[PDB]
Amino acid sequence: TATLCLGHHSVPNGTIVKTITDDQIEVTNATELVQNSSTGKICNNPHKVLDGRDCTLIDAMLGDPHCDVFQDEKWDLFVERSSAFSNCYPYDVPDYASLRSLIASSGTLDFITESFTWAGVSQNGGSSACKRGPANGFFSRLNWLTKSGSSYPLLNVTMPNNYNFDKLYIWGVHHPSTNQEQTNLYVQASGRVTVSTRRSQQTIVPNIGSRPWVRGQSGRISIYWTIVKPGDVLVINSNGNLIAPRGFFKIRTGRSSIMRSDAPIETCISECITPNGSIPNDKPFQNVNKITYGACPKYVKQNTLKLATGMRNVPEKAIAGFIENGWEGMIDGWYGFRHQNSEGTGQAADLKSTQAAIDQINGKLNRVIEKTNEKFHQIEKEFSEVEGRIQDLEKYVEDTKVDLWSYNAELLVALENQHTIDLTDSEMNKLFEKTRRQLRENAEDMGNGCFKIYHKCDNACIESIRNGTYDHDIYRDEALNNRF
Amino acid sequence: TATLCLGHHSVPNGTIVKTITDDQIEVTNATELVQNSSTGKICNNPHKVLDGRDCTLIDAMLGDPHCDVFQDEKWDLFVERSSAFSNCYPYDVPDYASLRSLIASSGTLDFITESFTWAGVSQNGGSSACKRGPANGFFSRLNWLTKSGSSYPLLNVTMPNNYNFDKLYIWGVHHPSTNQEQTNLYVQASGRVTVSTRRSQQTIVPNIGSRPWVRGQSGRISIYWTIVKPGDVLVINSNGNLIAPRGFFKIRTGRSSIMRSDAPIETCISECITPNGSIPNDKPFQNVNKITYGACPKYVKQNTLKLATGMRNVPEIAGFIENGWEGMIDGWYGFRHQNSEGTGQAADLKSTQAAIDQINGKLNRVIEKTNEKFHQIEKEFSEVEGRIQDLEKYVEDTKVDLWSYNAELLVALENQHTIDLTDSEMNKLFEKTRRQLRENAEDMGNGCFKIYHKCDNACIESIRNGTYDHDIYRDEALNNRF
Amino acid sequence: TATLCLGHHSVPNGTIVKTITDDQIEVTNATELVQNSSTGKICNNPHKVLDGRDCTLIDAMLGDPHCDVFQDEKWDLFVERSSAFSNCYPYDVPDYASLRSLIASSGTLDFITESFTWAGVSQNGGSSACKRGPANGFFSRLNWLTKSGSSYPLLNVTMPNNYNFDKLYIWGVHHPSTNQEQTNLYVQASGRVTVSTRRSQQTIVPNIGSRPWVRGQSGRISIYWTIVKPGDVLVINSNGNLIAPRGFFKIRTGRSSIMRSDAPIETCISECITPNGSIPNDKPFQNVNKITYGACPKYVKQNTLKLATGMRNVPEIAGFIENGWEGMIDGWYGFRHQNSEGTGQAADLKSTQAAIDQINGKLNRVIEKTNEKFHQIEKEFSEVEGRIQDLEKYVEDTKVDLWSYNAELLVALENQHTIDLTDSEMNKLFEKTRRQLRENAEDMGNGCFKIYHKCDNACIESIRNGTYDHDIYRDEALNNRF
Numbered sequence A: 001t002a003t004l005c006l007g008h009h010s011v012p013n014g015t016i017v018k019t020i021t022d023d024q025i026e027v028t029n030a031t032e033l034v035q036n037s038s039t040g041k042i043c044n045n046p047h048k049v050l051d052g053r054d055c056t057l058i059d060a061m062l063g064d065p066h067c068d069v070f071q072d073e074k075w076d077l078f079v080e081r082s083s084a085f086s087n088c089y090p091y092d093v094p095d096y097a098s099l100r101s102l103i104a105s106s107g108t109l110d111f112i113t114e115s116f117t118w119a120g121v122s123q124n125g126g127s128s129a130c131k132r133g134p135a136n137g138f139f140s141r142l143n144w145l146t147k148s149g150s151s152y153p154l155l156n157v158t159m160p161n162n163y164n165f166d167k168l169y170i171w172g173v174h175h176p177s178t179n180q181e182q183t184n185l186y187v188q189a190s191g192r193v194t195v196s197t198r199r200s201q202q203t204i205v206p207n208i209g210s211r212p213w214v215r216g217q218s219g220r221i222s223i224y225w226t227i228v229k230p231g232d233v234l235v236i237n238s239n240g241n242l243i244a245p246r247g248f249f250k251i252r253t254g255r256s257s258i259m260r261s262d263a264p265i266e267t268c269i270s271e272c273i274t275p276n277g278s279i280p281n282d283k284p285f286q287n288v289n290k291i292t293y294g295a296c297p298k299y300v301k302q303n304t305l306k307l308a309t310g311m312r313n314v315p316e317k318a319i320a321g322f323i324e325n326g327w328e329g330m331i332d333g334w335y336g337f338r339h340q341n342s343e344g345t346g347q348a349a350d351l352k353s354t355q356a357a358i359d360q361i362n363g364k365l366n367r368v369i370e371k372t373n374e375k376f377h378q379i380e381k382e383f384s385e386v387e388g389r390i391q392d393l394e395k396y397v398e399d400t401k402v403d404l405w406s407y408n409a410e411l412l413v414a415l416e417n418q419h420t421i422d423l424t425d426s427e428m429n430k431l432f433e434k435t436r437r438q439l440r441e442n443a444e445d446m447g448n449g450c451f452k453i454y455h456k457c458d459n460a461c462i463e464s465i466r467n468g469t470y471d472h473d474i475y476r477d478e479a480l481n482n483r484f
Numbered sequence B, C: 001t002a003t004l005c006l007g008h009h010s011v012p013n014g015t016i017v018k019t020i021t022d023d024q025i026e027v028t029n030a031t032e033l034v035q036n037s038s039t040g041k042i043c044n045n046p047h048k049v050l051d052g053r054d055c056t057l058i059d060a061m062l063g064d065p066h067c068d069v070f071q072d073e074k075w076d077l078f079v080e081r082s083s084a085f086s087n088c089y090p091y092d093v094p095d096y097a098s099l100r101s102l103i104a105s106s107g108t109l110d111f112i113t114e115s116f117t118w119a120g121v122s123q124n125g126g127s128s129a130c131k132r133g134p135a136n137g138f139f140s141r142l143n144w145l146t147k148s149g150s151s152y153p154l155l156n157v158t159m160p161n162n163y164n165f166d167k168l169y170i171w172g173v174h175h176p177s178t179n180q181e182q183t184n185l186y187v188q189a190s191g192r193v194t195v196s197t198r199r200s201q202q203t204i205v206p207n208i209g210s211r212p213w214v215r216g217q218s219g220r221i222s223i224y225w226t227i228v229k230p231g232d233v234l235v236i237n238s239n240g241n242l243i244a245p246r247g248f249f250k251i252r253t254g255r256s257s258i259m260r261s262d263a264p265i266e267t268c269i270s271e272c273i274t275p276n277g278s279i280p281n282d283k284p285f286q287n288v289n290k291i292t293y294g295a296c297p298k299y300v301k302q303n304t305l306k307l308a309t310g311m312r313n314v315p316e317i318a319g320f321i322e323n324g325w326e327g328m329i330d331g332w333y334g335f336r337h338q339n340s341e342g343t344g345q346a347a348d349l350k351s352t353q354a355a356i357d358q359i360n361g362k363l364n365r366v367i368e369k370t371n372e373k374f375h376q377i378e379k380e381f382s383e384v385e386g387r388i389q390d391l392e393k394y395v396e397d398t399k400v401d402l403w404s405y406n407a408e409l410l411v412a413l414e415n416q417h418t419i420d421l422t423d424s425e426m427n428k429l430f431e432k433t434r435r436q437l438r439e440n441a442e443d444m445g446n447g448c449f450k451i452y453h454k455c456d457n458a459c460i461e462s463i464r465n466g467t468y469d470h471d472i473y474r475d476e477a478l479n480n481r482f
C-alpha cells in the first residue's frame, strides 16, 4: 500500500501576537505597526522649514532690530527655539495666541509701505531699550508719534482698500509711567486711540503707572491688530498715545503653521515632522509625539502592535500530517504533500493554496483604515502658563481623541489577527477535503491527517493525485478487494 | 441508478462589494448606504420654518424699520438669507455670536412693554439714517434719551421681577463723533452707563472719535443684554449716552435653532433639513452637509458604501462546487436530479428562509435608527478670529474622521459575515442531505450524489421532505455498489 | 451492537443576548456589563474628601468669617453643597470659573503672610455687611485701605519672588455707589489700580453708580489674581480704590478637583465618586453620571448590556442535533452509551476546559481595565452664556455617542464569537470521536454512532481515552455490516 499526508511549514523562531479569543499565540511571522523612534533631525525637504534662531514670530513681524534678517520671509513650518529673546522696548499683546496663530497660518511676512500723513506731530521716536547700533531705535514696522513744539493736535487720517485682497494693520498704544511723563510726551493729560472700519471698532485708553524695569524702561506698549476687507476703509483717530503703523501685511490662506522645537535641521527628505524630529510614515500608527505636521501616522498610546502575517506555529514531534504537527523541513511553500511509497519517500508543495493564502494576507489593513491623514495647522497641545477654562477644554478634546484612536487601533489589530488565523486554518482544511474528495473509495484516513492508498500508487499516481486528474475507476476493483 | 445535485441561484448582473479578507467580491444583490443628493428645496413640514428675507435675527429683534413684519414671531428653524442688509443707525454688538445663539435657541420674539419713567430727559429720539416712512425714526425696542432744555440729570430707576420666568433686557451705549456732539446731546462731557442686578454688573464708558460714514453717521451704538432671574431686581444708573430699553423679552428653553441657507421653501414633508435642502433619512449615513437640523443621518466623507444582501455570484447536471444555477428563481437553494424518467428541479424553503431571516434587519442590531440634534456649534465662518475658531474646526474634524472610520469598518464586517453565513448555510444543507443517505449514496466530488438504487420521483420527494428510508434499499444498493 | 451519542448540557432557565446575526438568542449563562445603581453615599477612603458645608471654595479662599474653619486645608476632592451662601461684603469675580478651577486643581489653601508697607493710609477697614461678632469686619485675606487724615497718597510698593515656586496674589478694586462716597473714602475723585509683573500688567478704573442692596450695601468689589514666577517681581501702584493683599498662596500641581453633590459622606472604601455617590468599578461601563472622580468605568447611554458566558440553550438516547441534555451536570461535553449491560453517561475534560479557558478572561483582550481621570471640564451649567457653553456641551455629547457605539459593537462581536467557538468545539469533539472509529461504526444522523461490534465498558472507555484499536474488531464489524 501507500501513505499520503498533508501538512504545513513551521519555523524555529516564532512571534507571539494576540487575537480575540487568544491572549497569546505563536505565529510564523509578524510585522510591527507602531513607529516608536526618530532620528532626532528635522528634514528640509519637501517642506520649506524656516529656523527661527533667537527670534519669535511676533518679534520678527514687529521688526526687532536683531530680527531684521526675517524681512519679507516665507515658510511652510516656522520653528521656534526655546533660547529666543526680545531686545527692544517692553511690550505685551492682548490676545497673543490668536495673533500668533493668524500670522503662522498666513504663511508670509510681505510688507507694503503706505503714505500716512501726520500733521503737527514729530515722528520716528526711539528708546535706549531698542538700539540700532550706537543710536536709539524702535520697531521698524511702527511709528512712535510725539508732540511737536508744544502742541499735539487731534489726528484724523483715512486709508481705503482699493485692492482685491485683505490687509492686516498692526498698531499700538503707549502706557506712560507717570503723569509728568505723559504730559512731557503728549501734551494732553489723558490720551485716547480709536481705530475702526465700517464693520468693527476698537477704542483704547492708556493706563499710567510704575512697572518693573525692563531694559531701563518702566512703561509698556500694547499691540493691537485690524483686518480691512477689499472695498473697505480704515480710519485712525487719536489725541495721544499712538504707535502708528507704517503699512499693511498681505494675509493669505494656506497650509503653513508654527512649531516649537529644539531639534537641529539637516539635509534629508521626510514628509512628517515632529518636535522630536522627522519620522517615516510607512506605518499606520506612531508613538513619538502627538504634535505633527505633514503626512503623519496617528498617535496611539501603545508602544507596540504586532500584526500576524503567517499561520500558527506548531513544533514537530512513519510520517504524520498536519494534526498537532509541523513540518520544519518544508521551504518550497506553505502547504504540501508527503508520500511514503514502495519506491521511497518524497515531498512536494501545493501552489494554489499558498498563493490564495498569501493574496489574502497581502494588502491587509488597507481595506479598513486609510493610507495617511494630512493635517497642517491645529490647536496647541502644550502649555507653559496656567490659563483656566480654555486650556482645560483643549486638554479634554485632545485626551478624548487620543483615547478613542488607541481603542480603535487595539480592536482592529485583534480582529485582523483573528481573521488571518481563521483563513490559514480554513485553507489547510479545504486542501485536505479536496484531496479526500479526489479519492472516492480507494483511500482511508488514519486520523493523523494522512491518507492510506490500498492500491499500488506509483510516482505517476501521486503526481496525478496532486494535479487533479486521478481516476478512481482504474484502481477501484483492486482497492475494494484490498480493503475487504 | 440516479444523480442528485445541490446548487444555488445566480443572476446575469451582480454588484461588487468589499469585505475584510477580500478586496473586491461579487454578490447577487446590494444596497447603498450613503445619501449623497438633495432636491434643492426646504420642506415646511413638520417643522416650523420661518424665512427671513432681508432681515437677520438681531435686526428683527432690535426693531429695524424694514423688519417690522417679524414682530412677535415663533419658529423651529430660522433661515437667514445672504441678501439681508441693515437699514438703521450703525451699531456693533460685542460677542455677537453669543447673543445670536441664545436668541435663536429661545425660539420666540415675544416682547412685553414695561412702564419705565425717565425724569428730566426727552424720549423717543430719531436719526436721518433710520427713516420710518418720510419721518426720522429709530429701533422700535430701544429708547434714545437726550437732554431736555439745558440739563441731563442722573437717571436711577429700578424694575423688580415678580414673575416666575427669566427676563431678557436689551440696552445700548452711544459713542459720539466729537466732543461738541457729546456736549450738545448730553450736558455732561463724559457719560456712563451702569446696569446691574443683585449678582452681576456692567459699566460702560462711551468713547468719542470719528468713524467711516454709514448712511450719514460717524457715530456708533454698542448693544448689551442682561437676564433677570425671578425674584431678582434690575437697576439702571446712567449719567449720559444711554439707549434705554422699552421692556423685556420672554426667554425660554427649547429645541429651536437658526440656519444660513439660500435654498427656496416649498410644500413637502421631511424630518431632515440641510442648507442644500431637505434630504430623506432612510439611510444610516449621508454626504450632503455636516450642518443639519432634525432627525438626520450621520455625516461621512465616503461618497458610497455598498452593503451586501445576497450570496456570492458564481457563473455557471452539476452541483454547487464553483457552479451557479441561472434557472432557479423560486428560491436560493434546491436540488437537481437526473433520473430515468427525466430531469427535475425543486427549491428548498428552510435554508432560504434562514438566510433571509439572518440577512433582513442587519445594521439595526448595532447602530441606532436616527439621532435628533437641534442646536449645535457653528461650523462655517466668514472672518478669521483665532483660538476659538481653531478649536471648533479641530473638534468637527475629529468627529467626522472618527465616524467615517466607524462606518467603513462596520460595512466591511457585515459584508464578511453575510458571505460567511450564506456559505455555511449551503454547506449545512449539503451535509444534511449526505447524512440522510446513509450508505445508498456516494459523493461524486462536484457537489452531487450518485444513488445506487432505484430512486423514482417519489423517492426524490421522500429525500427532499426528510422521510427517506435507507433500510428499504440498503441491500439493493450494497449489491449494486460492490 | 452498541450506540454512542454525543451531546451538550442545557439549563432549565437561560438568558437572552444579541449577536451580529441574531436579534434574540438564548444562552445558558450571561453577565451584566453596565453599572446603573449606587448607595447614595460618598466614601472617604482612599481619597481625601473635604466637606464644604455652607462654604464655597472662593468664599473659603477669600476668608469669609463664617468660612474661617477652612483655613490652610488640603483635599483630593472638594464637595460643594447646594445650600452654600455668602455673609460678607457683596462682590463679583470677573472670569469666576477659571479662578475656581485653578484653586480646585491646586489642591491646597496654604497661605503665607508677607510684610507689605502702605505709607500714608489707614488699614484694616470693615463694613456692617461682614460681621465678626459685635464688631465689623472684612475678608481675612484682604486689606481695605482708605484715606488717613485728609490725604490719600500714591501707593507704590514692590515685593520680589526669591523662592523656587510660584506665588498667587489675590487683590480687589472697590466700586463706590456715589461720587460723595468716593470722595469721602478716597481724596481723589477718580482712583486707579495697576498691578504688574515683568511680563504682564492689569489696570482697573473703578466704576461709580447705584446697585441693588445686598446686606445693606450698594457698592461692589471685583476680585483679580496675579501669578508671580520664581525670579520675577510684583509692583502695586495705586492712588485709590485698592483692596490690598496680605500675602500669597502656594499653587501646586496635582490631581485634586471639585464636585457639586448633596450625598452624605460615610466611612467606606471606594475608588469611584459620582454626584449620586460612590459606585463599584468592577464593570467596564456605567450609566449613573457622566461626572466622575477617580478610577471609574466609562459612561454609556445604555442601561443594560448582556455578555454571553455559556452556550446556546436547546430544549431536550440521542445526540446534540437539535437536542440538549438536561441531566448533564458533570461538565459541558460528554458521551452517552447504550450497551447490552445498560445505559451510561460520561463527561469530557479537554473540550470543557478549552471552552472555559477561551471564555474566561474575555473582553479583557480589547478594552483596558480601568482609566484614571481626575480633573475635567464642567458638564452642568446654571446660567446661559453662549459660545463656550455650547462648545463644551457639543464636545461631551460627541464623546458620549462615540463610546456608547463602541460598547454596543464590542458586546455584539464578543457574543457572536463565543457562540461560534462553543459550536466549533462540539463539532471538533464529534469529528475526533468519528475519527477514532474508522470502519467499525456508522453515523446514524442525529449525532450518534452505531457500533457494529460488541463494545463493552472497557471498549467504551478505550474510545473515550483515545486508545481504541479498530483492527481487533475490524473483521467482526465488517461481517456484521455486510
Ligand SMILES: *[C@@H]1O[C@H](CO)[C@@H](O[C@@H]2O[C@H](CO)[C@@H](O[C@@H]3O[C@H](CO[C@H]4O[C@H](CO)[C@@H](O)[C@H](O)[C@@H]4O)[C@@H](O)[C@H](O[C@H]4O[C@H](CO)[C@@H](O)[C@H](O)[C@@H]4O)[C@@H]3O)[C@H](O)[C@H]2NC(C)=O)[C@H](O)[C@H]1NC(C)=O
Pocket (backbone or CB within 6 Å): A210, A211, A212, A213, C156, C157, C158, C233, C235
Ligand atoms: C515705584 O517703585 C518701583 C519699585 O520699588 C520703582 O522702580 C525702581 O526704580 C529704581 C530707580 O528708578 C530702579 O533702580 C535702578 O535699577 C537699575 C537696574 O538694576 C538692576 O541691575 C543692576 C546691575 O545689573 C543690579 O545691581 C540691580 O540689583 C538690578 O538687578 C540700575 O542700573 C539703576 O542704577 C542707577 O543708580 C545707581 C546708584 O549708584 C547708579 O550708579 C546708576 O548709574 C543708575 O543711575 C537703578 O538702581 C529699580 O530697579 C526699580 N525697581 C524695579 C523693581 O524695577 C519706581 O521708581 C517707583 N516709582 C516712583 C515714582 O518712584
Ligand SMILES: *[C@@H]1O[C@H](CO)[C@@H](O[C@@H]2O[C@H](CO)[C@@H](O[C@@H]3O[C@H](CO[C@H]4O[C@H](CO)[C@@H](O)[C@H](O)[C@@H]4O)[C@@H](O)[C@H](O[C@H]4O[C@H](CO)[C@@H](O)[C@H](O)[C@@H]4O)[C@@H]3O)[C@H](O)[C@H]2NC(C)=O)[C@H](O)[C@H]1NC(C)=O
Pocket (backbone or CB within 6 Å): A156, A157, A158, A233, A235, B210, B211, B212, B213
Ligand atoms: C475725519 O476723517 C474722516 C475720514 O477722512 C471724515 O469723514 C468724512 O466726512 C465727509 C463729510 O464731512 C464725508 O464726505 C461725505 O460723503 C458722502 C458719501 O459719499 C458717497 O456718496 C457720494 C454721493 O453719492 C459719492 O459721490 C461718493 O463717491 C461716495 O460714494 C457724501 O454724500 C457727502 O456729500 C456732502 O458734501 C457735498 C460737498 O459738495 C455736498 O454737495 C452734498 O450735498 C453733501 O452735503 C460728503 O461728501 C466722507 O465720506 C467721510 N469719510 C469717510 C471715510 O467716511 C471726517 O469728517 C473727519 N473729521 C474731522 C473732524 O476732521
Ligand SMILES: *[C@@H]1O[C@H](CO)[C@@H](O[C@@H]2O[C@H](CO)[C@@H](O[C@@H]3O[C@H](CO[C@H]4O[C@H](CO)[C@@H](O)[C@H](O)[C@@H]4O)[C@@H](O)[C@H](O[C@H]4O[C@H](CO)[C@@H](O)[C@H](O)[C@@H]4O)[C@@H]3O)[C@H](O)[C@H]2NC(C)=O)[C@H](O)[C@H]1NC(C)=O
Pocket (backbone or CB within 6 Å): B156, B157, B158, B233, B235, C210, C211, C212, C213
Ligand atoms: C437709586 O435707586 C435705588 C433703587 O430704586 C435706590 O436703592 C434703594 O435705597 C433705599 C434706601 O434709600 C433702600 O431702602 C431700604 O431698604 C432696606 C431693605 O428693605 C428690606 O427690608 C424691609 C423691611 O426691613 C422690607 O420691607 C423690604 O421689602 C426689604 O425686604 C430697608 O430695610 C430700609 O429700611 C430703612 O428705612 C425704613 C423707613 O421706614 C426704616 O424704618 C428702617 O429702620 C431703615 O432705616 C430701607 O427702606 C432700597 O431697598 C433700595 N432699593 C434697592 C432695590 O436696593 C437708591 O438709593 C437710589 N439712589 C439714589 C442716589 O437715589
Ligand SMILES: CC(=O)N[C@@H]1[C@@H](O)[C@H](O[C@@H]2O[C@H](CO[C@]3(C(=O)O)C[C@H](O)[C@@H](NC(C)=O)[C@H]([C@H](O)[C@H](O)CO)O3)[C@H](O)[C@H](O)[C@H]2O)[C@@H](CO)O[C@H]1O
Pocket (backbone or CB within 6 Å): A125, A126, A127, A128, A129, A144, A146, A176, A177, A184, A185, A217, A218, A219
Ligand atoms: C522726550 C525726550 O527726549 N526726553 C528727554 C529725556 O529722556 C532726557 O533724559 C534721559 O531720558 C532717559 C529716558 O529717556 C528716553 C530713553 O528711553 O532713553 C529718551 C527718548 O528720546 C524718549 N523717547 C521718545 C520717543 O520720546 C524716551 C521716552 O521719553 C520714555 O523713555 C518712554 O517711556 O525716554 C532716562 O530717563 C535718563 O535717565 C534721562 O537722563 C532729558 C535730559 O535732559 O531730555 C529730554 O528731552
Ligand SMILES: CC(=O)N[C@@H]1[C@@H](O)[C@H](O[C@@H]2O[C@H](CO[C@]3(C(=O)O)C[C@H](O)[C@@H](NC(C)=O)[C@H]([C@H](O)[C@H](O)CO)O3)[C@H](O)[C@H](O)[C@H]2O)[C@@H](CO)O[C@H]1O
Pocket (backbone or CB within 6 Å): B125, B126, B127, B128, B129, B136, B144, B146, B176, B177, B185, B217, B218, B219
Ligand atoms: C439734536 C438735534 O436735533 N440737533 C439739530 C441738528 O441735527 C440740526 O441739523 C442737521 O443734523 C443732521 C444730524 O442730525 C441728526 C440726524 O442724524 O438726523 C438729528 C437728530 O435729531 C439727532 N438725534 C438725536 C437723538 O439728538 C442726530 C444725532 O445728533 C446724531 O445722529 C448722533 O450721532 O442727528 C445732519 O448733520 C445735518 O447735516 C444737519 O443739518 C441743526 C440744524 O440747525 O439743528 C439742531 O438742533
Ligand SMILES: CC(=O)N[C@@H]1[C@@H](O)[C@H](O[C@@H]2O[C@H](CO[C@]3(C(=O)O)C[C@H](O)[C@@H](NC(C)=O)[C@H]([C@H](O)[C@H](O)CO)O3)[C@H](O)[C@H](O)[C@H]2O)[C@@H](CO)O[C@H]1O
Pocket (backbone or CB within 6 Å): C125, C126, C127, C128, C129, C144, C146, C176, C177, C185, C217, C218, C219
Ligand atoms: C468711612 C466712615 O467711617 N464713614 C462713616 C459713615 O459710614 C457713618 O455712618 C453710617 O454709615 C453706614 C455705612 O457705613 C459704613 C458701613 O458699611 O457700616 C461704615 C464703615 O466704616 C465704612 N467702611 C470703611 C472701610 O470705610 C463703610 C463704607 O464707608 C461704605 O459702606 C463702603 O461702601 O460704610 C450707613 O450708611 C449708615 O446709614 C450711616 O449712619 C457716619 C456717621 O456720622 O460716620 C462716618 O465717619
Ligand SMILES: *[C@@H]1O[C@H](CO)[C@@H](O[C@@H]2O[C@H](CO)[C@@H](O)[C@H](O)[C@H]2NC(C)=O)[C@H](O)[C@H]1NC(C)=O
Pocket (backbone or CB within 6 Å): A036, A037, A038, A275, A276, A288, A289
Ligand atoms: C518626544 O518628545 C516628547 C516631548 O514631550 C517626549 O515626551 C517627554 O519625555 C520626557 C522623558 O521622560 C518626559 O519627562 C516628559 O514628561 C515627556 N513629555 C510628554 C508631554 O509626554 C518623548 O519622550 C520624545 N520621544 C522620543 C522617542 O524621543
Ligand SMILES: *[C@@H]1O[C@H](CO)[C@@H](O[C@@H]2O[C@H](CO)[C@@H](O)[C@H](O)[C@H]2NC(C)=O)[C@H](O)[C@H]1NC(C)=O
Pocket (backbone or CB within 6 Å): B036, B037, B038, B275, B276, B287, B288, B289, B380
Ligand atoms: C451643499 O452645499 C455646500 C456649500 O456649503 C457644498 O460644499 C461646497 O462644495 C464645493 C464643490 O465641491 C466646494 O468647492 C466647497 O469647498 C464646499 N464647501 C464647503 C464648506 O465644504 C456641497 O458640495 C453641497 N452638497 C451637495 C450634495 O450639493
Ligand SMILES: *[C@@H]1O[C@H](CO)[C@@H](O[C@@H]2O[C@H](CO)[C@@H](O)[C@H](O)[C@H]2NC(C)=O)[C@H](O)[C@H]1NC(C)=O
Pocket (backbone or CB within 6 Å): C036, C037, C038, C275, C276, C288, C289
Ligand atoms: C444620578 O444623578 C443625576 C443627577 O443629574 C440624575 O440625572 C437626573 O435624573 C432625573 C430623573 O429623571 C432627570 O429628571 C434629570 O434630567 C437628570 N439630570 C441630568 C443632568 O441628566 C440620575 O438620574 C441619577 N441616577 C441615579 C441612578 O441615581
Ligand SMILES: *[C@@H]1O[C@H](CO)[C@@H](O)[C@H](O)[C@H]1NC(C)=O
Pocket (backbone or CB within 6 Å): A029, A030, A031, A309
Ligand atoms: C514576514 O512578513 C514581512 C512582511 O509582512 C516580509 O517582508 C518578510 O519577508 C516575512 N518573513 C518571512 C520569514 O517570510
Ligand SMILES: *[C@@H]1O[C@H](CO)[C@@H](O)[C@H](O)[C@H]1NC(C)=O
Pocket (backbone or CB within 6 Å): B029, B030, B031, B309
Ligand atoms: C435586493 O434587496 C432589496 C432589499 O434589501 C430588494 O428590495 C430587492 O428586490 C433585491 N434585489 C432583487 C434583484 O431582488
Ligand SMILES: *[C@@H]1O[C@H](CO)[C@@H](O)[C@H](O)[C@H]1NC(C)=O
Pocket (backbone or CB within 6 Å): C029, C030, C031, C309
Ligand atoms: C455564570 O458565569 C459566572 C461568571 O461568568 C459564574 O460566576 C456563574 O456561576 C455562572 N453561572 C452558573 C449557573 O454556572
